[PDB]
Write an enzyme that holds these catalytic residues in place. Structure first.
Site, PDB file in Angstrom:
ATOM      1  N   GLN A   1      30.075  35.261  40.133  1.00 28.27           N
ATOM      2  CA  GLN A   1      29.481  34.288  41.046  1.00 28.27           C
ATOM      3  C   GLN A   1      30.548  33.396  41.671  1.00 28.27           C
ATOM      4  O   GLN A   1      30.611  33.241  42.899  1.00 28.27           O
ATOM      5  CB  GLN A   1      28.441  33.449  40.305  1.00 28.27           C
ATOM      6  CG  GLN A   1      27.928  32.253  41.088  1.00 28.27           C
ATOM      7  CD  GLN A   1      27.012  31.369  40.264  1.00 28.27           C
ATOM      8  OE1 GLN A   1      26.686  31.687  39.121  1.00 28.27           O
ATOM      9  NE2 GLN A   1      26.595  30.247  40.842  1.00 28.27           N
TER      10      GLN A   1
ATOM     11  N   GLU B   1      24.087  39.915  39.291  1.00 32.35           N
ATOM     12  CA  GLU B   1      23.095  38.871  39.498  1.00 32.35           C
ATOM     13  C   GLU B   1      22.544  38.994  40.909  1.00 32.35           C
ATOM     14  O   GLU B   1      23.262  38.681  41.870  1.00 32.35           O
ATOM     15  CB  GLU B   1      23.722  37.495  39.283  1.00 32.35           C
ATOM     16  CG  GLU B   1      22.738  36.340  39.281  1.00 32.35           C
ATOM     17  CD  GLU B   1      23.394  35.025  38.903  1.00 32.35           C
ATOM     18  OE1 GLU B   1      24.625  35.014  38.688  1.00 32.35           O
ATOM     19  OE2 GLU B   1      22.680  34.003  38.819  1.00 32.35           O
TER      20      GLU B   1
ATOM     21  N   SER C   1      36.589  34.426  38.082  1.00 32.25           N
ATOM     22  CA  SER C   1      36.830  33.270  37.232  1.00 32.25           C
ATOM     23  C   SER C   1      36.965  33.714  35.782  1.00 32.25           C
ATOM     24  O   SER C   1      36.152  34.505  35.291  1.00 32.25           O
ATOM     25  CB  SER C   1      35.695  32.255  37.371  1.00 32.25           C
ATOM     26  OG  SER C   1      34.444  32.845  37.061  1.00 32.25           O
TER      27      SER C   1
ATOM     28  N   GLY D   1      32.582  35.264  31.803  1.00 33.41           N
ATOM     29  CA  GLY D   1      32.980  36.454  31.073  1.00 33.41           C
ATOM     30  C   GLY D   1      32.551  37.742  31.741  1.00 33.41           C
ATOM     31  O   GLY D   1      33.233  38.764  31.618  1.00 33.41           O
ATOM     32  N   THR D   2      31.421  37.721  32.450  1.00 29.54           N
ATOM     33  CA  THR D   2      31.001  38.890  33.216  1.00 29.54           C
ATOM     34  C   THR D   2      32.045  39.246  34.266  1.00 29.54           C
ATOM     35  O   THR D   2      32.537  40.381  34.320  1.00 29.54           O
ATOM     36  CB  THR D   2      29.642  38.630  33.870  1.00 29.54           C
ATOM     37  OG1 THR D   2      28.658  38.388  32.856  1.00 29.54           O
ATOM     38  CG2 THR D   2      29.216  39.826  34.708  1.00 29.54           C
TER      39      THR D   2
ATOM     40  N   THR E   1      30.883  24.247  29.333  1.00 29.06           N
ATOM     41  CA  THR E   1      29.434  24.421  29.337  1.00 29.06           C
ATOM     42  C   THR E   1      29.029  25.672  28.569  1.00 29.06           C
ATOM     43  O   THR E   1      28.009  25.674  27.868  1.00 29.06           O
ATOM     44  CB  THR E   1      28.917  24.482  30.774  1.00 29.06           C
ATOM     45  OG1 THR E   1      29.434  23.370  31.516  1.00 29.06           O
ATOM     46  CG2 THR E   1      27.397  24.430  30.796  1.00 29.06           C
TER      47      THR E   1
ATOM     48  N   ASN F   1      35.877  25.633  46.294  1.00 30.10           N
ATOM     49  CA  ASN F   1      36.049  26.883  47.025  1.00 30.10           C
ATOM     50  C   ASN F   1      36.939  26.689  48.246  1.00 30.10           C
ATOM     51  O   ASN F   1      37.804  27.523  48.530  1.00 30.10           O
ATOM     52  CB  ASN F   1      34.687  27.440  47.438  1.00 30.10           C
ATOM     53  CG  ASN F   1      33.847  27.872  46.252  1.00 30.10           C
ATOM     54  OD1 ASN F   1      34.375  28.255  45.209  1.00 30.10           O
ATOM     55  ND2 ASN F   1      32.530  27.815  46.409  1.00 30.10           N
TER      56      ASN F   1
ATOM     57  N   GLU G   1      58.903  40.166  47.526  1.00 31.21           N
ATOM     58  CA  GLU G   1      59.750  39.013  47.244  1.00 31.21           C
ATOM     59  C   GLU G   1      59.111  38.116  46.192  1.00 31.21           C
ATOM     60  O   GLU G   1      59.800  37.600  45.303  1.00 31.21           O
ATOM     61  CB  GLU G   1      60.018  38.231  48.529  1.00 31.21           C
ATOM     62  CG  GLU G   1      61.362  37.530  48.550  1.00 31.21           C
ATOM     63  CD  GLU G   1      62.522  38.506  48.564  1.00 31.21           C
ATOM     64  OE1 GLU G   1      62.442  39.515  49.295  1.00 31.21           O
ATOM     65  OE2 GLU G   1      63.512  38.266  47.841  1.00 31.21           O
TER      66      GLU G   1
END
EC number: 3.6.5.-
Lengths: 440, 427, 427
Positions: A11, A72, A141, A145-146, A180, A229, A255
């Site tokens: 997400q 999702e 991210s 974990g997904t 969280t 973002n 480089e």
């Protein structure tokens, strides 16, 4: 070496990809329709760029080569509602009905490996359509974990597929203070070993540092994920400025690979961007380039929850936007060396690379930005990364002591052996990094 | 797996499901007949989730109401809002459960279980995106305490992959219309602790207290309590009802809210507890909602978190709030309540914010906690257990029912296992 | 060979044919006075198939009505559709067969079989494209079960090549007023197995059950049951008549719906079966009809899928239906009902689609199956015969008729042989 494949996983990764595509459209002044947008320039595309991220079509419509993968359906519907989906191809995006797990259990499992072949043939067809390739860009991210497991699987499959282009992975790191998700450290630690095995270069960014920056530099009362973002989009655009727009000193991806990897295993660069401030203060304050170079060393701009002073200096690069005087940045880097802010090493010390790009930085309307003709993006290799690794590993071990949840992971796709192996790998990486940093 | 079915049973749980559907159609916007009026498309997806799109643009709620005394279901079917109800939704029999655990399932349930399983199988055939069941029943009510446990065991045996979610109301220990009510409650929880993956604690006495404090009414109205619990259920399901910054699944909430397969019991709290006329006195701010979530009596489970020990907490919000602000608030309340909060996690927080806000509220919150004090809420009942059939009064009734002391001792041992888990994990 | 003849006899088969013609004139739309009202070209073809182009554009349906009571023809003349008829289209004799198959087809049948065979030969000379012969009679009543059996025998002797569609009604085991009813039924079928090639199991008790579960009628009325069977019979002929994606003929079923010629019985099922007043809640879909077809409660034969092993199945549909949907449904039901679906086929499926929408419906479906539950009815009727003529009560009537018990044992042994054929093929 003219095309770079970008992948949006999870997400947060999909949102970051949307922000980067929007900013890329804004820099070249590209509208949802385009056809280039429009055909008058030179250098808004064509020529390159866009020829590195936007696929050229027979009609001329530039298709941003992006693969949005997530299990999702809500996020996929959201990204399909916008004009970005019209910019992309309907077959490039991948949809999933049921999310993998919370979060790394199924994302790395064989159920997450079922679509590996599908996305692999998709990438192969996309490469057959285009001509040339420079590297693989990844956006997922490490908190999710997904996305972490899916991106690690894609990276392994691409390494086993081509292994000829540098594999780039932009990873988002959670706040070391609060988490969280309860399995977030588990997912991140399990993904670190996979990225070590697969990724040729990494990118570590902290959300809490971004929030502190936008609250302090931009002086905003309410942070937003959209602002994060936008800031990451500005960062990523600052990375590929020379590849999109020509400059006085055009820099190459190889480089970056040479500068950021001065050892058998060194592929963890930290990102810093300056000057960043509210647009009002940008209209009120006018700093020099030396002040910007000094602010690059501030703990805020480093986008990490670690002090850069304790870190030890290594080979770093600095990209510059708009008009930049070579003598001025030479004087500034000499003054910085004279300051000795970050402790230098005996191998690298003369390791400040300078690259100039003609494209001036652009400020998005959603998130404020210091309106300046020239920007500075410093990719450093300081040793505060080991500090962040140890900070997360201490909590990881404190959890794994009792771990409160191991039944789900050992029943779905994992085992305590894999957790212990990832823990030992992280400890060995921290030890090696401290060793290579301390021998100076 | 986005669709969910709201199961209904118990002489009081039927009204709960009715009020739930009423609050749903009032929140998202729907005609009593079934004509879609929500806006714009996400609410249409939620209609697909909870309703079936009938012919001519009509909707029918996906609910299974199974109880006795069909007069009540016929009367509530005569309601204006309950006009879109499908005749296949409610499967009722005759005539009364007698407020006993045996006649609820051991005598009458054995003949209607086949029909209700046929109905639920037809429902599962009609929609394949089903992920869980929402059951509202009375733990003290005879129809509820009898049929709910049997149907839950049947679903657990037949559909182990599908999730479980219940909203059983606990009988009041201080006041009771009869002594057999908590006895049936215990005989039902004996199996509910095994065949359920999620349950919510609700006490009618806590509802009376909160309407005496907020509503400020001497005689509490069961309809208003239905409205409150329906608003709570709506704020719970808003994670899937409306897309937000972070939307989670009930499995994602469960795996983070319990470390072990136990701990299905959950303490409920709703905010803002808006009193009549207090809309102008107070302004909607997150510290006040946090304080209301911290109040022991504001919870409707209800248990004292200070006497207990915070095991797992999770406050899901709706409306326009700041992520950094709520993170600062949660860190402050975890630091200042470090004695209540368990510390080896160390962060037992799980917050999920909803983008939109409920109608009439700029911001709302639903808090779900796990404290060790809940054992007391069990103990008293168990005590009442050993205080009620130790005189062996009306034991001939249960011997005629066919019940034995083995299952009573089994329920007592289940309560003992519960309190030992409460002390494992010492308070 | 699109033209098909219809024959109506017996006390109830007369009303069955009356309802059949009612449904015929209602499908395309036609006046009861022979006034053409269809549009445009096909309806004239179906008229030529069933009706006759009389003077002044008139149309009279080709039907042979015969019964021992002229009150029956008076009653069907009292109806609107079917009031007018050429006097040669129907011949009625006197007076009754006493509910006896032997006496019925010996005395009551032989005196009029000559005239009715002359009449049907005349109409066969008039109808060049005759293919099949629908039959509407009652197997329960001795009068019908004897007269129609004799007529089917004579037609088989005369027209061995033409098809024979037999929609007779099996007796109900609950009815015990006249014990000679199942005995006459088995004596009639013992000959009709060779006289007829296409027979359809129809139980009165099944009709009562389906009208009490769907129509919820207080007392069984032949009107609604005749409407239902007329709709079912009209669907299978409009599958060929009305244009569709795949039409089905009687020869197609004779070569595909049955593996071995000794089998002639075909189970029945109709959909949609919506309760009275719930048509607003119902939405016509493929899965609901698929579920209805494979349920014994929806069948009218009525054979149980769970009891009898499936030899073969067939499902015909009307209206706009997709081939992909029915193919998926057939694959699912083959995967789940592989136990009943026999292994030597191994995949039994026969499909036919009618493009035009049904009369008053968007889609309507019929179902036929060949299961091992019909041999159960054979065993029941054989046990009835044995236990009834073991008492030797009322057997003096049949001694006066002149029939021999050796013939009865031969009939029962042939029925047991057919059961053994349905046990080869074991259940």
């Amino acid at each position: 070496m003219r095309e770079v494949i970008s992948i949006n996983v999870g997400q947060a990764g999909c949102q970051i990809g949307n922000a980067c595509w929007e900013l890329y459209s804004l820099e070249h002044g590209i509208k949802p329709d385009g056809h280039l947008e429009d055909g008058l320039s030179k250098p808004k595309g064509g020529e390159e760029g866009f020829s590195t991220f936007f696929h050229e079509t027979g009609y001329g419509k530039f298709v941003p080569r992006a693969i949005y993968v997530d299990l999702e359906p809500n996020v996929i519907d959201e990204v399909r509602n916008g004009p970005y989906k019209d910019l992309f191809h309907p077959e490039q995006l991948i949809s999933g009905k049921e999310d993998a797990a919370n979060n790394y259990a199924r994302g790395h499992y064989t159920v997450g490996r079922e679509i590996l072949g599908d996305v692999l043939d998709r990438i192969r067809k996309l490469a057959d359509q285009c001509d040339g390739l420079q590297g693989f860009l990844f956006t997922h991210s490490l908190g999710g974990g997904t996305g972490s497991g899916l991106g690690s699987l894609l990276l392994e499959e691409l390494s086993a597929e081509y292994g000829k282009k540098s594999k780039l992975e932009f990873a988002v790191y959670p706040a070391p203070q609060v988490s969280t998700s309860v399995v977030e450290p588990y997912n991140t630690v399990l993904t670190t070993h996979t990225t070590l095995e697969h990724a040729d270069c990494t990118f570590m960014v902290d959300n809490e540092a971004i929030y502190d920056m936008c609250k302090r530099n931009l002086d905003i009362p309410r942070p937003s994920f959209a602002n994060l973002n936008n800031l990451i989009a500005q960062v990523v655009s600052s990375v590929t400025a020379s590849l999109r727009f020509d400059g006085s000193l055009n820099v190459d991806l190889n480089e970056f690979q040479t500068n950021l990897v001065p050892y058998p295993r060194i592929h963890f660069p930290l990102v810093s961007y300056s000057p960043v401030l509210s647009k009002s203060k940008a209209f009120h304050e006018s700093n020099s380039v030396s002040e910007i170079t000094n602010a690059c060393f501030e703990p805020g701009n480093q986008m990490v929850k670690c002090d850069p002073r304790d870190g030890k200096y290594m080979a770093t690069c600095l990209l510059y936007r708009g008009d930049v005087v070579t003598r001025d940045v030479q004087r500034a880097v000499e003054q910085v060396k004279n300051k000795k802010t970050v402790q230098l090493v005996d191998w690298c010390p003369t390791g400040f690379k300078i690259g100039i790009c003609y494209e001036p930085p652009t400020a998005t309307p959603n998130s404020q930005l210091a309106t300046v003709d020239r920007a500075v993006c410093m990719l450093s290799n300081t040793t505060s990364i080991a500090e962040a690794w140890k900070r997360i590993d201490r909590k990881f071990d404190l959890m794994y002591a009792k771990r409160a949840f191991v039944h789900w992971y050992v029943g779905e796709g994992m085992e305590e052996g894999e957790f212990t192996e990832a823990r030992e790998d992280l400890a060995a990486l921290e030890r090696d990094y401290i060793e290579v940093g301390a021998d100076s | 797996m986005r669709e969910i079915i709201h199961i209904s049973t118990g002489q009081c749980g039927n009204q709960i499901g009715a009020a739930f559907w009423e609050t749903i159609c009032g929140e998202h916007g729907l005609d009593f007949n079934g004509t879609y009026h929500g806006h714009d498309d996400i609410q249409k997806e939620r209609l697909n989730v909870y309703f079936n799109e009938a012919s001519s643009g009509k909707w029918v709620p996906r609910s299974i109401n199974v109880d006795l005394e069909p007069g009540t279901i016929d009367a509530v079917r005569n309601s204006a809002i309950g006009n879109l109800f499908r005749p296949d939704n409610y499967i009722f029999g005759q005539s009364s459960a007698g407020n006993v655990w045996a006649k609820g399932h051991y005598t009458e349930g054995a003949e209607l279980v086949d029909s209700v399983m046929d109905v639920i199988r037809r429902e599962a055939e009609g929609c394949d995106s089903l992920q869980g069941f929402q059951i509202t029943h009375s733990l003290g009510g005879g129809t509820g305490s009898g049929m709910g446990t049997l149907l839950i065991s049947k679903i657990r045996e037949e559909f182990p992959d599908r999730m479980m979610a219940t909203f059983s109301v606990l009988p009041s220990p201080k006041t009771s219309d009869t002594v057999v009510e908590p006895y049936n409650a215990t005989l039902s929880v004996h199996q509910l602790v095994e065949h359920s993956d999620e349950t919510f604690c609700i006490d009618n006495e806590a509802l009376y207290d909160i309407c005496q404090r907020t509503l400020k009414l001497n005689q509490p109205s069961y309809g208003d309590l239905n409205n409150l619990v329906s608003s709570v259920m709506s704020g719970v399901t808003t994670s899937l009802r409306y897309p937000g910054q972070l939307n989670s699944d009930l499995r994602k909430l469960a795996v983070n809210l319990v470390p072990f397969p136990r701990l299905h019991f959950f303490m409920v709290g709703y905010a803002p507890l808006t009193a009549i006329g207090s809309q102008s006195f107070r302004s909607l701010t997150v510290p006040e909602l946090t304080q209301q979530m911290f109040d022991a009596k504001n919870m409707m489970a209800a248990a004292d978190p200070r006497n207990g020990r915070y095991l797992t907490v999770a406050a899901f919000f709706r409306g326009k709030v700041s992520v950094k602000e709520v993170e600062d608030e949660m860190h402050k309340v975890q630091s200042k309540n470090s004695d209540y909060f368990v510390e080896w996690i160390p962060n037992n927080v799980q917050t999920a914010v909803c983008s939109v806000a409920p109608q009439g509220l700029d911001m709302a919150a639903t808090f779900i906690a796990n404290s060790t004090s809940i054992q007391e809420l069990f103990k008293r009942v168990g005590d009442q257990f050993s205080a009620m059939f130790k005189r062996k009064a009306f034991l001939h009734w249960y011997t005629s029912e066919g019940m034995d002391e083995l299952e009573f001792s089994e329920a007592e041992s289940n309560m003992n296992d519960l309190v030992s888990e409460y002390q494992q994990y010492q308070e």
